[PDB]
Amino acid sequence: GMTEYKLVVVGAGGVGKSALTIQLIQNHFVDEYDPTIEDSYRKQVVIDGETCLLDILDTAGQEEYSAMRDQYMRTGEGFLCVFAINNTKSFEDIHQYREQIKRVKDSDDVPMVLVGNKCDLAARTVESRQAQDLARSYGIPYIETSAKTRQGVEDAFYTLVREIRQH
């Protein structure tokens, strides 16, 4: 049948990372969620005219279980590496997430996207040029998203699927 893509969200905690998958998967248009329901993290979508199933792993809230990162990352085919645009430390953490994904996957060329997330109205401290330059240094796309308006959210996940398809 249709292709299933196993996508994994990684990134610092405490800075609204979970809004990316929630807004995707949501009833886009009813602001509501029960994460405990069976397949609150599976979504059938059409990308460039080809239907597929996204299975998204987002372990937001488990960041302190730092020795489980490999156990969780090993499940994934593509990765969203998320930082918050008002949290410079979360941006600085990206390099190490990327190194750990390369190590678990035993590959220098794992499908991944860099995502800069706007999780509140607090002042931005990472400029888009800084994040574009980082993404370009890694050879991966950069997408910015809003945690409140759903802007950028479909682009982040669809861009990752395109990276997998074109790998």
């Binding site: 602001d31 994460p35 960041e63 489980m68 156990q71």
Partner: protein, 469 residues
């Protein structure tokens, strides 16, 4: 007919229900949203008790009402005006007779006494199970003491005097079993010889038991105040969620210790014995329903430094591969089989906490604090109910104690385990990965040989328990 109520202008909790102030879900009603006045009315409703709702509300209310304001509101709820004499009472009094006061007696019996007793039950639950509000605000405690200590009148007296004593006990603040715990098991290390304690010298049964007692105590110590508001993810997490973080840091340390024992055993035959012993410990964690322990082992065996050790993998017996496979299968498909197994076993158990953390965080992030209806903001109570369903599940598995004896030296050994030493996490996990590359280099580099490091027998004593008379 229904009882008449005080006028809503002298008593705010008699306003009629409308969609501008309360919305129910589709045999007692379930509240979707409401004003704080309506939530407190239904918390203390005259027609029924709702002990679930008391726990849900007292667990979650600080997201929409400060503790000082809650106390003010429930004192207001408690102070119910009595109705004036009716026409028949007046006529009796005018004739020098005693009135029957039928409506007054019914209102006391069916409205005032149940509402007042249910306010006191809120106070009692608040003090017994959510006393941190009072630890953190001494003036709130003074107000509660004063309120309880000045309730007059005999219908409430037993509970007033009891709650007064409960408060005084909480300010200055034993298990029985069906059977005897099993005998503590020893292998190469003997009682009192803590300097020889290590992965292969302690008995694998007793490693698993003592880690299960430690991990069970760490699980049982986490209170809901560490979880609501997603506070373990925020900047003050060390202040607000210390028992949760102590629990997680223990789990992380044990996973890293298992990885360190494996990759620092450079001799292949010895490293196989190490891995086999860790899978025996996993088997006993499964037998004990210690799922935290199960996942600690799975996380180490799936880590980058360990996963790649194909020469070690080749020598592990298929039966042990099958044990590890069935443990990893619990985590597959977003923990589908783990969730079913947790719900099917007979406690005691030690749940894996991380799933609860993700579900609480996503429930709080994915639902709005308020619902807007007819121009009014109503508290979204359904969201709080969902959070308290999770905290209630956590608490249900915190009740049952393990019937296992503590070994104080083995306990201390695992409490003090510190595989990273003074190294930072990145430099330590790079060290583990480089150690993996040293002991089993990437193809086509030849596989080196390394000397043995253990002078004692590597044969496991097994994981079936012994029983002398």
């Amino acid at each position: 007919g229904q009882m008449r109520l005080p006028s809503a202008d002298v008593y705010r909790f008699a306003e009629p229900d409308s969609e501008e102030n309360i919305i129910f879900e589709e045999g007692i009603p379930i509240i979707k949203a409401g004003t704080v006045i309506k939530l407190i009315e239904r918390l203390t409703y005259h027609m029924y008790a709702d002990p679930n709702f008391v726990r849900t509300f007292l667990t979650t209310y600080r997201s929409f009402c400060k503790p000082q304001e809650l106390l003010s509101l429930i004192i207001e709820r408690f102070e119910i005006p009595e109705p004036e004499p009716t026409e028949a009472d007046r006529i009796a009094i005018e004739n020098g007779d005693q009135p029957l006061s039928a409506e007054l007696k019914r209102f006391r019996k069916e409205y005032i006494q149940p509402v007042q007793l249910r306010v006191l039950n809120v106070c009692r639950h608040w003090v017994e199970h959510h006393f941190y509000d009072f630890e953190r605000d001494a003036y709130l405690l003074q107000r509660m003491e004063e309120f309880i200590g000045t309730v007059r009148g005999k219908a409430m007296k037993k509970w007033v005097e009891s709650i007064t004593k409960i408060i005084q006990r909480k300010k200055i603040a034993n298990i029985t079993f069906q059977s005897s715990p099993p005998t503590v098991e020893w292998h190469i290390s003997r009682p009192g010889h803590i300097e020889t304690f290590d992965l292969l010298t302690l008995h694998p049964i007793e490693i698993a038991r003592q880690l299960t007692l430690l991990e069970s105590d760490l699980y049982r110590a986490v209170q809901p105040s560490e979880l609501v508001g997603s506070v373990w993810t925020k900047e003050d997490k060390e202040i607000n969620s210390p028992n949760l973080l102590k629990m997680i840091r223990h789990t992380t340390n044990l996973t890293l210790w298992f990885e360190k024992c494996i990759v620092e055993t450079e001799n292949l035959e010895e490293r196989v014995a190490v891995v086999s012993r860790i899978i025996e410990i996993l088997q006993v964690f499964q037998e004990l329903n210690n799922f935290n322990g199960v996942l600690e082992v799975v996380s180490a065996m799936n880590s980058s430094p360990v996963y790649r050790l194909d020469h070690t993998f080749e020598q592990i017996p298929s039966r042990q591969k099958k044990i590890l496979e069935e443990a990893h299968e619990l985590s597959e498909d977003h923990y589908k089989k783990y969730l079913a197994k947790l719900r099917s076993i007979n406690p005691p158990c030690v749940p894996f906490f991380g799933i609860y953390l993700t579900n609480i965080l996503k429930t709080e992030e994915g639902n709005p604090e308020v619902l807007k209806r007819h121009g009014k903001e109503l508290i979204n109570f359904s969201k709080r109910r969902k959070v308290a369903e999770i905290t209630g599940e956590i608490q249900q598995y915190q009740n049952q104690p393990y019937c296992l004896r503590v070994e104080s030296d083995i306990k201390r050994f695992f409490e003090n385990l510190n595989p990273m030493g003074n190294s930072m996490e990145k430099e330590f996990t790079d060290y583990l990965f480089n150690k993996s590359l040293e002991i089993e280099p990437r193809n086509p580099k030849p596989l080196p040989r390394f000397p043995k490091k253990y002078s004692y027998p590597l044969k496991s004593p097994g994981v079936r328990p012994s029983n002398p008379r």
